[PDB]
Amino acid sequence: QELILSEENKTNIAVLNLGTNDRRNAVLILETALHLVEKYLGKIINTSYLYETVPEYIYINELMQNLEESKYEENKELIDKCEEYETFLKNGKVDNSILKEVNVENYLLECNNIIVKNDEIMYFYNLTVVVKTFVNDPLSMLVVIKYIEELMKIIDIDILFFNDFTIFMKNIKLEKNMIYKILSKYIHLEQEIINNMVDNIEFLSIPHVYTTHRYSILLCLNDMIPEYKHNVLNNTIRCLYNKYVSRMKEQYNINIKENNKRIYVLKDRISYLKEKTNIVGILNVNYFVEPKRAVQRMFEMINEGASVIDIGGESFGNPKISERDLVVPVLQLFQKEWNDIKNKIVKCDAKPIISIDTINYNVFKECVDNDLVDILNDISACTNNPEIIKLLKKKNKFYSVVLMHKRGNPHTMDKLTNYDNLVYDIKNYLEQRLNFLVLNGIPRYRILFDIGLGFAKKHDQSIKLLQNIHVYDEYPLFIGYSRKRFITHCMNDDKDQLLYQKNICGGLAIASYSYYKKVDLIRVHDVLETKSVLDVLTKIDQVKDPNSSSVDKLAAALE
Amino acid sequence: QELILSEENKTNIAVLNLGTNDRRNAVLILETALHLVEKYLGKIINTSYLYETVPEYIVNYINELMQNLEESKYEENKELIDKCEEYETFLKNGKVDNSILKEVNVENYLLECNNIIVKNDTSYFYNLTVVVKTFVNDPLSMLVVIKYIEELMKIIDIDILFFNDFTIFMKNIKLEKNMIYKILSKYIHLEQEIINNMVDNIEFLSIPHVYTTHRYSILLCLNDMIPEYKHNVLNNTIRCLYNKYVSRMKEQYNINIKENNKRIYVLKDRISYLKEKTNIVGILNVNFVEPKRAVQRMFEMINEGASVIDIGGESFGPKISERDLVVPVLQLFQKEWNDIKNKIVKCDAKPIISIDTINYNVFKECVDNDLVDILNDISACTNNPEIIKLLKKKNKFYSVVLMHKRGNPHTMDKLTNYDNLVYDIKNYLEQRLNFLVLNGIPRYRILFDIGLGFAKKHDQSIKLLQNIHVYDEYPLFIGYSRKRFITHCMNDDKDQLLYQKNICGGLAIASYSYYKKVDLIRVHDVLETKSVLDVLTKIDQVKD
Numbered sequence A: 001q002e003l004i005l006s007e008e009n010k011t012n013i014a015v016l017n018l019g020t021n022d023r024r025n026a027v028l029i030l031e032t033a034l035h036l037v038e039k040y041l042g043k044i045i046n047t048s049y050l051y052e053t054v055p056e057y058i059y060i061n062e063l064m065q066n067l068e069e070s071k072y073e074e075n076k077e078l079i080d081k082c083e084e085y086e087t088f089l090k091n092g093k094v095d096n097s098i099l100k101e102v103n104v105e106n107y108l109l110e111c112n113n114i115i116v117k118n119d120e121i122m123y124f125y126n127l128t129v130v131v132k133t134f135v136n137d138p139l140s141m142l143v144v145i146k147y148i149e150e151l152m153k154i155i156d157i158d159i160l161f162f163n164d165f166t167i168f169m170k171n172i173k174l175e176k177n178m179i180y181k182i183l184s185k186y187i188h189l190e191q192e193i194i195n196n197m198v199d200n201i202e203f204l205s206i207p208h209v210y211t212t213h214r215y216s217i218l219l220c221l222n223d224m225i226p227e228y229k230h231n232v233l234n235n236t237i238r239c240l241y242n243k244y245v246s247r248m249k250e251q252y253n254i255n256i257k258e259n260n261k262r263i264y265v266l267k268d269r270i271s272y273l274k275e276k277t278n279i280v281g282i283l284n285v286n287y288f289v290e291p292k293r294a295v296q297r298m299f300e301m302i303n304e305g306a307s308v309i310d311i312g313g314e315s316f317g318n319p320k321i322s323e324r325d326l327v328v329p330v331l332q333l334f335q336k337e338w339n340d341i342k343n344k345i346v347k348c349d350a351k352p353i354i355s356i357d358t359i360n361y362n363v364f365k366e367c368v369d370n371d372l373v374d375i376l377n378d379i380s381a382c383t384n385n386p387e388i389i390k391l392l393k394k395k396n397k398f399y400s401v402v403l404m405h406k407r408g409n410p411h412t413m414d415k416l417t418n419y420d421n422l423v424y425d426i427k428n429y430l431e432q433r434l435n436f437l438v439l440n441g442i443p444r445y446r447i448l449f450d451i452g453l454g455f456a457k458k459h460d461q462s463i464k465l466l467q468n469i470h471v472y473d474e475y476p477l478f479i480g481y482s483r484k485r486f487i488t489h490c491m492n493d494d495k496d497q498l499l500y501q502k503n504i505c506g507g508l509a510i511a512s513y514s515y516y517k518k519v520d521l522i523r524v525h526d527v528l529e530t531k532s533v534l535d536v537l538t539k540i541d542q543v544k545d546p547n548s549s550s551v552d553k554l555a556a557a558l559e
Numbered sequence B: 001q002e003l004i005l006s007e008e009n010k011t012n013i014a015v016l017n018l019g020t021n022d023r024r025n026a027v028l029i030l031e032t033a034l035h036l037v038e039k040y041l042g043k044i045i046n047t048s049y050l051y052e053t054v055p056e057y058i059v060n061y062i063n064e065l066m067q068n069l070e071e072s073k074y075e076e077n078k079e080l081i082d083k084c085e086e087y088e089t090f091l092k093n094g095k096v097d098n099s100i101l102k103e104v105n106v107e108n109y110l111l112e113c114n115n116i117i118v119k120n121d122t123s124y125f126y127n128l129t130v131v132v133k134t135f136v137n138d139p140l141s142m143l144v145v146i147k148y149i150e151e152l153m154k155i156i157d158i159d160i161l162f163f164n165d166f167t168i169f170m171k172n173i174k175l176e177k178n179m180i181y182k183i184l185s186k187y188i189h190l191e192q193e194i195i196n197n198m199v200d201n202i203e204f205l206s207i208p209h210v211y212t213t214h215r216y217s218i219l220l221c222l223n224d225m226i227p228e229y230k231h232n233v234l235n236n237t238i239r240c241l242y243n244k245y246v247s248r249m250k251e252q253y254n255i256n257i258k259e260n261n262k263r264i265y266v267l268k269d270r271i272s273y274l275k276e277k278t279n280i281v282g283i284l285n286v287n288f289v290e291p292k293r294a295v296q297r298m299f300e301m302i303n304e305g306a307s308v309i310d311i312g313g314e315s316f317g318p319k320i321s322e323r324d325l326v327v328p329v330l331q332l333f334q335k336e337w338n339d340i341k342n343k344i345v346k347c348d349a350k351p352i353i354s355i356d357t358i359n360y361n362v363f364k365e366c367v368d369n370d371l372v373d374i375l376n377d378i379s380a381c382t383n384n385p386e387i388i389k390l391l392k393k394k395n396k397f398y399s400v401v402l403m404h405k406r407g408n409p410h411t412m413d414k415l416t417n418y419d420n421l422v423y424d425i426k427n428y429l430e431q432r433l434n435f436l437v438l439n440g441i442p443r444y445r446i447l448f449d450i451g452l453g454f455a456k457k458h459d460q461s462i463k464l465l466q467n468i469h470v471y472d473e474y475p476l477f478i479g480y481s482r483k484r485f486i487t488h489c490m491n492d493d494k495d496q497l498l499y500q501k502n503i504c505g506g507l508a509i510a511s512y513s514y515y516k517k518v519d520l521i522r523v524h525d526v527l528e529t530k531s532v533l534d535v536l537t538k539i540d541q542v543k544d
Ligand SMILES: Nc1ncnc2c1ncn2[C@@H]1O[C@H](COP(=O)(O)OP(=O)(O)OP(=O)(O)O)[C@@H](O)[C@H]1O
Pocket: B143, B157, B158, B159, B160, B161, B201, B202, B203, B204, B205, B206, B207, B208, B209, B210, B211
């Protein structure tokens, strides 16, 4: 089977799974795996969310710089469709398997064995990806995958699928040149590494053994490929996923979701979806500029409770100063000030996340290259310049993004009000945007949804989007209601000094609502007022003993 | 004339149903009834809530009637009572004297009721039950007097549900014109068309009332007052009867019988549906603070949205008395308002006035001078129970907030041990309500208050809020505004800063109160609180 090393380039679809148990470093570890996969295997065109997952019963920064170059070559360029991947999804006719393919009944029994053999032989942070690969075979990829593992040194990368193939290779152990040969074909090579690998490649199963048995795997695949149907499976990934969840409720009285949590990432750390309402402080430099003043306003917001600061330099209501001249210097003064540290040598938890509210590629490029920002807040949902998406992946870094719905601009917005179906048009729009970024290899868990309150919505439509916010229960949700006219509209009425108060207080009501609907991030001017509110509500929800209400009631009834 | 007009004075327990279907005058019609019951029939020792109720067929001339009522031959003793033996006898079903009217047995009663029911085959009813310790000899005499009461009011229906433990069914009652006069004269100082009109009205008498078992609005009311009660003719206790009726309505048909039969509380003279609105009570602390500035503050608050104003002259935790602070302020306001020049046509815009006092003398003056509507007693009428006597006038009833505290503002933070915090307080409030109810204060006029920050550590004030659902059946009134415990919640110019956080923390509780359907919140910052409620209300208004 020597044509494994054929230099004739193929295009292949491979679905991977990546797991670590280092919680403190999950983001860092798994985004490092991702970058290496991108570098050494092909193009990432789908990813699941990050999940904290329970088991199924019951120096990187310096090593990143010097890395063997790939023999293949990278285009960060954008794509609309993928013909190969579309074929993988429908199961369509793909070139026959290089390796020998076992049949389904033969495959099932081999996997029966491996599960039971390991059943008897007796926190996870999981992620799936889809690779468009220039690798000819799953085994060659497994050689590379395990070399990726080996250099990273903690990190487990499996191969869940390879095209439509059904494969169970029992006898595997091979030439320490054959390993050198595979790794000569794809990576531009510069000794103890291979030794550890020959031992580990005992066998190969395509699809993976625990594909249909580990919940955490179904959970990841249900994000990426809900409709996929391998010949090996009884049903589509989503149906399996549903049966698993349904069946765990009927037969064990367990909701399996409870111990397996969806994660979104803002900067470098895990955030559990729906578990915290984060405050985002508004700094509109636009509001003859005062960069010293505006940076103290930034610090004012940090001490007031904001986890995230949102900075932009355009007006939503200006003679000759540019957007860049408004935001880059303030951000630079912030980085300068913060960095002349006076408080701690352990300030890895205390730093505010910085978001830039821009649609301009050039602004965001300058920011990213000067390490000035963490999050792109793009109110066009990257529709003004999709190339901006490219600036979200550096060689090692990833950046997170807020995608927001609007129509038109502040001057034309208020008229652009007709929707076929308000709630679902806006939801469908955003999922579409997410599909695009995900196709272009923006990690799904780094993408935040924003419905764009007051942007091309009548005030009753702003209210209605809020009435139906549960529609984002599956998603990181970032909203901005602060000081907008729809809040005022709700009120049954020196006159406009009262109006400003009535508006800030009505905002605080949406803070509460947002707290109960479990919104991930809220974009507010009045950071103190909001944090106060959130603190009280968080306290009222901290129940020391969760079923004491019924106990105490019975204690009273029998006096 | 025989043993019906017998000179021996008796003490009987009677149970009454009160009904009207004028919605706007529901309170005025039914309390007129309550007064007339209290004047002519005996002593009111229990009442149900007020209910807006689905029909089960299956004008200021009334204030002029109160100025011309003939005198009762019997007395109103207003002294407080702790006990009523006849009443405990009624509930236990122990025995009173022989019935003066011929009784029938269970079999025969059931037949004759079912005879009436079968033979008997758009606006809501406003319903109320009462227990009366009565000096009337028998149900027939009592029904006669009831009819006089109904006719005087000219709109109203008063039924006898029980009368002692008697089972009576008298079929073809024929009463002579001079007999009714004689019955009426036995109880009322009579000094003409009324009595000729009554002669027909009484065709028969049934005890218990025919529809007792068969109308939901009846079991609803009785479930408040006498859940344990089991008359011989009944197949189970009031509560079980009520319960079985709720569950049966959910299987037999698919209705939640609760949804359309609503519980009502009364703040002044209007209906409030329990749990349908979170009202704002504006705090006016008058602690020499001059009447003019304060009355302006009252006006600022009404425009800012307050439904109720709560005026207090006492410190919370010199040479000026409580009366001299509060009474003048309330006198100026009564006057200033009566300049209704902006509105010669609107008078329902008037704020309800709450007096935050415990001193009998202060409230007496307020009451004598129609300066207030509600007593806000922070001791729950514990400190001087005589104050309960001032909530009834001949024609008015006043509403009362009953707050829980221990000790005084100095002793307070040390009186913090509770076996079962949530239910100790609740049961304390229930005990206190039972005590006003026994003394003839309408149950639907009593609001509950957990007393946040009064003999409560900060975590206990939080715990009480966390368990506010415990008052889902009750009219609930809370005061969190600018209390120390709000600040306890917060994580970390100093003085005004913490002050801002505390007002905003209070708006968080305003939000929580909204979702928990709290009936009244006592706040300093009215405009701010009204803004929160308005937005939350909007988000909840799913109408297209
Ligand atoms: N316990 C009772 N209370 C009141 N009325 C009674 C009672 N038992 C029998 N009756 C008779 O029933 C008659 C009907 O009462 P009324 O004229 O108020 O009409 P109603 O309200 O339809 O009756 P009900 O309240 O019995 O449904 C009374 O006039 C009275 O003669």
